[PDB]
From a paper:
V/A-[name] is a motor protein that shares a common rotary catalytic mechanism with FoF1 ATP synthase. The V1 domain of Tth V/A-[name] (A3B3D1F1) is an ATP-driven rotary motor where the central DF shaft rotates inside the hexameric A3B3 containing three catalytic sites, each composed of an AB dimer. When powered by ATP hydrolysis, the V1 domain rotates the central rotor against the A3B3 hexamer, composed of three catalytic AB dimers adopting different conformations (ABopen, ABsemi, and ABclosed).
The nucleotide-free V/A-[name] (Nucfree) was used for cryo-grid preparation under different [name] reaction conditions. Using signal subtraction of the Vo domain, we achieved resolution of 3.0 and 4.1 Å for the V1 domain including half of the EG stalk in state1 and 2, allowing us to build atomic models of the V1 domain of these states. The three AB dimers in the V1 domain adopted open (ABopen), semi-closed (ABsemi), and closed (ABclosed) states, respectively. The Vnucfree in the ground state is activated by the binding of ATP to the catalytic sites. When ATP binds to Vnucfree, which is in a stable initial state (ground state), the enzyme transits into the steady-state for ATP hydrolysis (upper row).
Residue numbers in the entry:
A (entry chain K): 81 to 120
B (entry chain L): 61 to 188
C (entry chain G): 169 to 209
D (entry chain A): 194 to 578
E (entry chain B): 1 to 578
F (entry chain D): 5 to 474
G (entry chain F): 161 to 472
Write the structure that this text describes.
Amino acid sequence: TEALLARYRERAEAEAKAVREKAMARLDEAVALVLKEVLP
Amino acid sequence: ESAGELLVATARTQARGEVLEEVRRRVREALEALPQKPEWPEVVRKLALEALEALPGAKALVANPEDLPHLEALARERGVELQAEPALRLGVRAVGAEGKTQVENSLLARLDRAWDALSSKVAQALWG
Amino acid sequence: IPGIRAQIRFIQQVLEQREREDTFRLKRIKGKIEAREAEEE
Amino acid sequence: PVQRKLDPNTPFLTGMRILDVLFPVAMGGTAAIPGPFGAGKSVTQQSLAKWSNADVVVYVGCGERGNEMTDVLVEFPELTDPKTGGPLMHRTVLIANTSNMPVAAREASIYVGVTIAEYFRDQGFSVALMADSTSRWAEALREISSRLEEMPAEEGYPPYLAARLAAFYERAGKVITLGGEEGAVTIVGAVSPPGGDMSEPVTQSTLRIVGAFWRLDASLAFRRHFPAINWNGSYSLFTSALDPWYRENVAEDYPELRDAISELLQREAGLQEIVQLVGPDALQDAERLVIEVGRIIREDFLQQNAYHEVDAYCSMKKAYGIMKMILAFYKEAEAAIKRGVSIDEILQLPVLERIGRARYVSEEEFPAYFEEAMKEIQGAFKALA
Amino acid sequence: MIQGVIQKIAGPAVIAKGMLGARMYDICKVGEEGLVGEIIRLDGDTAFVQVYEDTSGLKVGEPVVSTGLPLAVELGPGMLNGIYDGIQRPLERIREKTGIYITRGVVVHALDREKKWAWTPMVKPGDEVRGGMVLGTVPEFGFTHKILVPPDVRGRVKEVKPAGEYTVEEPVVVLEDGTELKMYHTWPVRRARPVQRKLDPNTPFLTGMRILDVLFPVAMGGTAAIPGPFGAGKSVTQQSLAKWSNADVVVYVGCGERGNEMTDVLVEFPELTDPKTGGPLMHRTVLIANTSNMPVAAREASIYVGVTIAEYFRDQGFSVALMADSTSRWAEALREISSRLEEMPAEEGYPPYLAARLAAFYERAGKVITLGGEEGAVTIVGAVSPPGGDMSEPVTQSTLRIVGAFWRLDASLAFRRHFPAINWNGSYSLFTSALDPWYRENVAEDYPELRDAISELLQREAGLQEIVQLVGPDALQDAERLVIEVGRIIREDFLQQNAYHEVDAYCSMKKAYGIMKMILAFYKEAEAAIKRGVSIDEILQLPVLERIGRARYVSEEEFPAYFEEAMKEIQGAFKALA
Amino acid sequence: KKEYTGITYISGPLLFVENAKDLAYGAIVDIKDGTGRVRGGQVIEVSEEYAVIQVFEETTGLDLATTSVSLVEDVARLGVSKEMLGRRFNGIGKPIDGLPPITPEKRLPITGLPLNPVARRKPEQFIQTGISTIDVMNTLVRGQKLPIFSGSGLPANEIAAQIARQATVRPDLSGEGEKEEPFAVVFAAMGITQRELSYFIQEFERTGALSRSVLFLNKADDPTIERILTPRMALTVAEYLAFEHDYHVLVILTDMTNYCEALREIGAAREEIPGRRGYPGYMYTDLATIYERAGVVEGKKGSVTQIPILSMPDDDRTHPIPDLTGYITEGQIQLSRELHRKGIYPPIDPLPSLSRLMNNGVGKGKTREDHKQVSDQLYSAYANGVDIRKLVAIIGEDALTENDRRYLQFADAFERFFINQGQQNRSIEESLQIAWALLSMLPQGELKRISKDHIGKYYGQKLEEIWGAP
Amino acid sequence: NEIAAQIARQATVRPDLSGEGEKEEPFAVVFAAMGITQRELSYFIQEFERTGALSRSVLFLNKADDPTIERILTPRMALTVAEYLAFEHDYHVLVILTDMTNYCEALREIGAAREEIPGRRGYPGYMYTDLATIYERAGVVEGKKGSVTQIPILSMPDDDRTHPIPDLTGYITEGQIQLSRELHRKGIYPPIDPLPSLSRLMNNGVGKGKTREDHKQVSDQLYSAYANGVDIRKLVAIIGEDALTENDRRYLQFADAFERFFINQGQQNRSIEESLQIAWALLSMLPQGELKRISKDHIGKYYGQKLEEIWG
């Protein structure tokens, strides 16, 4: 009934945390790259 | 039985969008802090040369009041009347010969022009 | 039924006539203003 | 600017039985009323402005005769507000544009009216707009295009006419103001197509925007049968969403009775084709019953006297009771004909005098008369056995 | 040879800039992307070009070139068993090249330059050769694809190529003046091929259906019109005509057709259709397919391309049947072009010159003598689809004044499981009188009289239906019962025909003639019996009926014996009848 | 970026700019005005002298000095991605639900490349639409262009919503067995209003169909050129999804009439001579280009099926728009005002409704084998029942034979139950069973269009579930 | 034209039924012409000079042979003079317009010479405004005893009601009086058919205190009965006369007697009471229960009169 929605949430926050933490360790190289192409 | 995966997917997408907008804000930070570093003259010279070569016959090279030293000699030798303007931060503004056309060449213009092309490689380097 | 067909075809013909009239008028005025703007250049 | 758009859920009263029953209009809705001259659009607009339920009414006479405006000006100060009882002029604001006034003022008047309506909505009121004519608006636009020398679209109208009409009608709605207050604007648009042509471009552009449509016909007007709503060609799209409000406010089974009335009318209209080729005498008694019930409904429920001082304004409950007794009588007539009883004696039954005369009864005395009608109708069929 | 740039892109398919030497109606490559365009209006240095594909993405300054040629189609070996678009482009090679989509700006050759063909010369150096004379011989799917001198070429042979085997670009024969005759050539689409003389329709074109071949005959080179109602199975009739006629070559053309046309036009023809002799029918078939969303120019020029191919194959030395799939869409494309050219309408938005175009197309068909002295014939069966089933529309008017025969379809006819659903009341044919002498000299002297008798029986049966339905059939009189029964027997055992069956699919002339003879003999015996006093019910159960109605599924060889024995059975029936 | 100043002419939706040689035909431009607001416009003409710009917005702030013009794209394209499922766009590609812009995998031209005819193949599988009358009499088939004809007041939007939120395929009925085919719906809105927009939001949200739904919404007050662009964007998305990820896409076009009106007005805005009935002479090819880019191909598993919805302008079928639709499509489903008045939902009229490829969509392997014969028998029986009902109004049921009364009862039951399926959802099996039960009212042997075997197999079952169960 | 002349001759208010005002000064007739023919002009001149009213009536003649463009100015001059008279000296003025068709002819010609955007059938697109510049110059003013009444005369070309001129006029004006050809062919004068006719200011000209109070009920009942008679004629056109019931024949008799007597009057002048008595006598034919629109008291104190008691 609502335990299904309970772990709907729980794994929704799980996925959000997973993607945010996975991305947070991959920022410096992306910033340097983007600055590299945008600057001629 | 189905709303759960919809909310999960939308949360994933909005988290990715938040990370991407944070990346864009970091890029803006990196761009607007350039002039203090002495690499500013090289950037302004690149922008001036590309603007002048993209605009044949340019009569004027509009610039910033504080950007005269790095571009005055080039503007003089090109045979144009350069003038200052508080606007056009981080770039230069070429003017057409007829005076009815111009090309504005701030860095932010290039950045938000090419952001849509950036997005693919930004995504596949951030998570690929 | 034949009278109904007669009325139908009469009205259809009249409406076609009006359509042709107004479309010719529009083409004529477009050509006239085109020629006058061109000669005014 | 508005904070948010809210779905319409409350009907907008009109005072007319047919309009406020068969073709309801929500609070923030729109309704077009095209027709030829002589159908009595002035009386309709005047009655709608007089007997509405909104607090403030905005009247916009886009290019119409000044005599009706003068009649309104000299008449309203003598009518008490149905809500507050004060002179009706205080709640009424008029925008005047006579036909002989300069051409380029009609669009300005229309926009001024809609803007003032939006303002009074933002103040937290109920606003009902009466755009008395849009064909004049379109004619002024065409006249401007005439000496602008453009390439005109269909029938000489400028191409952006549909967009202009859409922008004008879309401003209406029920919204929450910037100060977090509820308000709504109601638009009653009228079209004067050239020679009663409902197929003209402006009306067709209307039918693809507005949610409620009303029509008028010449044959009913000749019979003087006002409101003269051509029931066949008129439809409403706000009927569905208004069911819970009706159940909570008027009667739980009222929508079912209304749909039964519509079914009766549809069956009568279907039978009319055979009627117009064979004659009423050749039909069976049970079908003559349908025809006469349809006639009773047409001339005792739909018809309304716009000048009678007691039947000018009608409540929804009164019309509901009238429909209830009509359908009860028809069902009993069907049951009686099921017992070999012919129709001729039914038409001679005296309770039909009460049925016809009912609508003139005052607002408050109506329940007693309705009870008397119910008992008399039950007895008229049961006592004969 | 003439090159220019772009000045004004005023909108879709409109160009203009100084192109001094350009001439009227020349195909033009346009832009660096090489879009195809046509010059329609020359003024001063500048000229206007109409592009087939949409001009989106272009800009001023792009170079514009002219090909110095009008619209033309390459005519040479290798065109059979192929599929082409509205402007004669190979669809299968395009699919292999650019994928599932037809990308704008793609270049393809109609004839493949790689495949080699066994050349067979027919002349020696020093011989006079004129246009239209035969020059070479090449086999292509079972029969020789001859080589013809171009119509406007005359000279003396300098040298010929040896036998060998060569590609299409190889110039086989060189004239003494130095011109090089390639294996193929091109012909402008809007010029009919020259002909020595035009002959008369004195011979019939055998379709293969008894109703068509008997009631409404079409001669070699006539024109026929059929309506296009849905559910009448026009595909079945078209396939039967294509695979069972006496036409040597079959060309299918479809312009502006609905989206789901391949369903029956591109699957059954390659596989499901097999000629009376050989494997696939496709080996002697050429298609021009052009769906709805193709550019309008192809939808307008496909008819001319098809008829040009037909004239080529007629001068070749064969007999060719050309089937236009639909002309309503063609008139639609014409109206769209008119709206592009801003010519004022005539009626229902159609250009005034529609009848001229229809005449100029339909007159190309016929039976003529080729320039090489051979005999050939092009016969056209055009299909028209009324917008709402009404013939009153102008295109049907212009069609019915130039067709020699107009068969009638109806979905109701097939609704009662009657095939083919060819109405036998509203249809007419104007080839009957001219074909009467050949019918007498090849089928029977009384054959036209038998046809007239069957027509009279049909008319009588039609004139009695209402008195039957209003009152009831079984309650009528014995003579009327007899005539109703015989009309029903005829219309269910002679007009009717299965198409999918091995035997009933094809029927010669004399088979139908003998069937009619047997039916009329039985009718005469029945009339004699009923006048004598014998009632209808005994006639209904005579042993002759279940045999005469069963004659449809007998082979051609047995038909004389079955016919004579059934005639003897009819004779014996009357001996029992009297 | 290049800026073109030098505005020389302003009138209505058009304005001229000079020295714009670097603006390709059809290019999209922005307008930076005195107030700084960024407008939108498309270049409709170019020449060495000057260029023409059409503006799809209001023009109550422009001038000849402070206004500036610049380019944003050579050709109007669209950035697409698979993750777009669940999002809603305003018709020019802007998300509106309140989530950040998507990441485009590849940018594509809106006007697609026409399909090579040899790529297509014969459609063979149907779709369980959920509406019994559709699923039995007018069975939709994959790769079909099946329009719906509406009326002045008939509720087309609710029917579209139910079809979108009930559509599915039946692999189990065929030899496929298990479900493995991804399925999605692309929804197009043209010339809609506030009421329709809110109703569509509620309908696609409450029942949970949004997660597999794509929406393109365009209000009525919004500019016309956006309404022109919207269906092309929808078709582009559908084609990309179907031919790159094997989906089956069920495209819906809520309005073709508003689209045609916008096209006519836009064409008139360029001073182009109108053709028949005042509509552009090329409307046929434009309607074809919208419709014809849908079907099934060879070697791929994708399939695009399209259901445009249009309202007949005055209940007529001779109007140019429905006439062209009949030219292009493969039949129509004609709604009837009569049933809607009488209270029946959905008011679908079986007498004029007709499909074209349905003969190849029903049968064993595709459906059960009794589909076609039952459909034909039901059609004929309903026709007879209606005729006899009109006859009884003058003769009377006493003076009629048995089969006439049985037809009358059968027709009443048919129109009371088979067509009045309401908001409920049915399967093909339930529709077939209900049809069998209704045909069971008629005496046996009358079913001339049905073979003996199926009569013996199925005749006898009567109406049981419909009255006892929802 | 004869109807207009007679109306002008006989027009007078009835203060005795109201009690206000006792001067009864005759109206001042204003005649404006637009391409009038010689015969009609002679008729009008002879009538006005016979009536003894030409001493107080301003005539603005404009014949057919006169220049076309002059038609554009005569109506405006006539209206200006009438307004000046009425609002400077309180003269009660009735204005007669000879023809609007010629006005439309001249307006369309001058517009087409300028090549404007035409209307439905080539008429100028500002014709509505042009006519509004004329018709609205009429009515009454608060605080003044003057009065301006317009009686325009226009001709529908093909006896048509969808024509632009009558349609725009009906949109602009408050009701109209329409004639009928069928009644004219049958020797009825004036051939005024009450069905298509309408007057929007009817409710302000009746009621207790003005004429009589039972005006409205009588009028609406007459319309209802006449419409029933017309529908019964239409039905008889197919079903014949035998299948008619008793009350259907009653309605048919009412309709034909109505047309023969109430409409046909032969140039005689009637007062309101004579017409009301005739209407009551006509209504006496129908059953007393069918008058559902009429109050009981009026039926009680007015019903039962027989037709021959009016004339023999």
